[model samples]
Target: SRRNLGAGHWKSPKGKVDPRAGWQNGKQTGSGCGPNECKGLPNRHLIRPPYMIQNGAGPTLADSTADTDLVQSGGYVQYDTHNLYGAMMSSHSHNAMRARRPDDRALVITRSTFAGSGKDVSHWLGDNVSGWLWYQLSISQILQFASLYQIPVVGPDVCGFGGNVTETLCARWATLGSFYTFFRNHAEIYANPQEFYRWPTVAQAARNGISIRYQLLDYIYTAIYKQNQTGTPALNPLFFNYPNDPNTYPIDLQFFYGDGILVSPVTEENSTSVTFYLPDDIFYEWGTGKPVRGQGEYVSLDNIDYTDITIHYKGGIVYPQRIESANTTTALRQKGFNIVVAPGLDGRAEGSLYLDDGVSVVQDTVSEIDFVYENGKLTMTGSFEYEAGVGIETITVLGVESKPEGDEDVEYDAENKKLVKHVDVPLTGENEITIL
Candidate 1:
């Protein structure tokens, strides 16, 4: 019933059978059953499934011959398979876990993913070389995968994956990654660890950069929730943001963080400033209080330090919060809220911030933080609780004028954890405050 053949006969199978299925069966048997049994084999050791085999060389069962040898040698092939292996293993693991706890949501972060794999687990773009190209590739891959897989959450190893990363590149990648669903950084074997504190020059800068992301976490989480419920993506390509704008078609370097924030990361090295496109909206720098009106011209910030870059909140669009934090845990722990209000020509504006535990699934727990102008005073209110042994921090009131500026900056008394205003708010056209 069984036979062994060389590459000649093994290359072609008798009938049509799922290559992956055959590979799985042959993999389980711990035998080198030849290509006749195992259909699709990866060419490279690191290559995973779904990637086309180079030169039309389909996978062969002989690849599993090592399993047979291992079994005979009193060993087991527990974790030999590379990239695609984790996905297969996770499917079985999740099935078992689900069987045990049907109501619990099972999630696995897989290294390699195949088609239709989103139903079972989420995937991150694999490690990439540290460079502008890699950063660019990460975004492209994420967008492409999200569109194809219909998976809302896809991210890359922030600040490049492997090899050495410079301060400029890291800062740029961090900003870009903030717009991603899962923003995280990985350390390389030979490279210094990529923590905000690690780079002194860029530490404060990176922290400031990430603070913008945390400030918008409410919006980001809300978008994710919406996407998960309705099968839409939080981060979209330019086409999604500008369906009719022809200029947006070729621009892959920029994208939308939800529907509100548009970002274009500077990816070049030794370059003092990079050109950015603003789509008919008033844009502002996240750090500096500079305002750039949109005329479709490149706004240059050559004197702009590498630590800080540019961000634009569409004019007439109200951004819900502006509080800064060191990280998500810290941001949520502080529970501080800041509202950034940008008024249109009519001196009217509105923005919303959605809040919940940084880690929770219940919709009932989610609350909306709103910033609105009824009288001359701008009212900001949102529900947040402090962790045990921690108190409220400082909050600042910022005014969005021709130049964005803070009017009344408030600090929380550590003992009381209450917000106290630093300056009196003037009757103005546009102003905002942060409750730290």
Candidate 2:
């Protein structure tokens, strides 16, 4: 049997004690090294030196990185695998969960991650202070994780993790956080309570945000499915949409939720207005269906409410939304869809929707639907293998020019140039609707 080596047992020169000698006693001393016990160690490997070390210093291992002599699997030293600890733990936890229920899927969220950690677990931005700066930082962090690092499921603690948060800040964060691929509210024990229910405004903000999130759940879920099928990211910065536009290169405060919805939150503390870059493209407001033609410059949206977040549906995409939202996603799934078509400059739009039983490890059947709108007509075609247990209840077409002569079920809003029709259709065949 191989003997386990302690830090004190490493081979050293004759008459010279190992550098890690008396580390236990030094730890008991609670300062640097114990009296007269720090002479032998080299300067770089010295334990807990008084001054801050540079990046190249390669500071000696302490409790933070685990003791130096600790052994990992396959004879690898803990020192070499320190950075991989969180990823390894995540993989192992995923394995344990799978072992418990081999036929079901497992969900794991971890703080620390390495390059390939996205395959094993989701990651949340760590230990952010409750403030406006951290709120803005969360957006960039999420963009890096999703687009740069390939981690699709990532988010910050909604209202933040540390420091006492103000009501307005918490409300803004609550609204913005709804657009995150992963959304949750948590805090440290030392921090003040920031639950949405704590403040009336925050509660309303949470309600509105969660309602929109639920309505858009299927749209985002389909994007997640696409990421699983292909390697595309579900959430993206503005540059991903308009790679040719130079103005979007530096913008991190704005991002797209799935393929259609563009989200720009008020980042300033107590400010109702936000200035964000909009590339040269066509967009429709999510709330009012008003058209906005971008000129590849910074645009300021003013007089926004505290509970409201700015979101736009990029033209050329058909969005799938739940008409009636429920408290739970499971319950929401049973509700019908409201399709919104925003035509692009070329007078066309296209999008896809994917559906399956949410929790199955191996889906028995999957439904994939594609929506195409061109020349005053919309068509739905694809494999309708899985039934969502609901049908389409409404079809809203934005940027409609003229009112179609139809029955009471179809209504036209000339002020917004939007047309809505009740299309009670099931997911069984290729469905088509024309605005005549």
- Specify the highest-lDDT model's number: 2
Q: Model 1, range 237-315, lDDT digits (tens) per residue?
A: 7678567777777777777777657676675676757676666555544434245567654455555566665566554
lDDT of 2 by residue, 86-190 (tens): 889899999999999886778888988889887868889988889899999888998888887878899999898998999999999999999999999999999
lDDT of each: 0.56, 0.82
Over all chains combined, what TM-score does candidate 2 have?
A: 0.86
The stretch of ten residues in a row with the least summed lDDT in candidate 2 is 1-10
TM-score of each: 0.63, 0.86
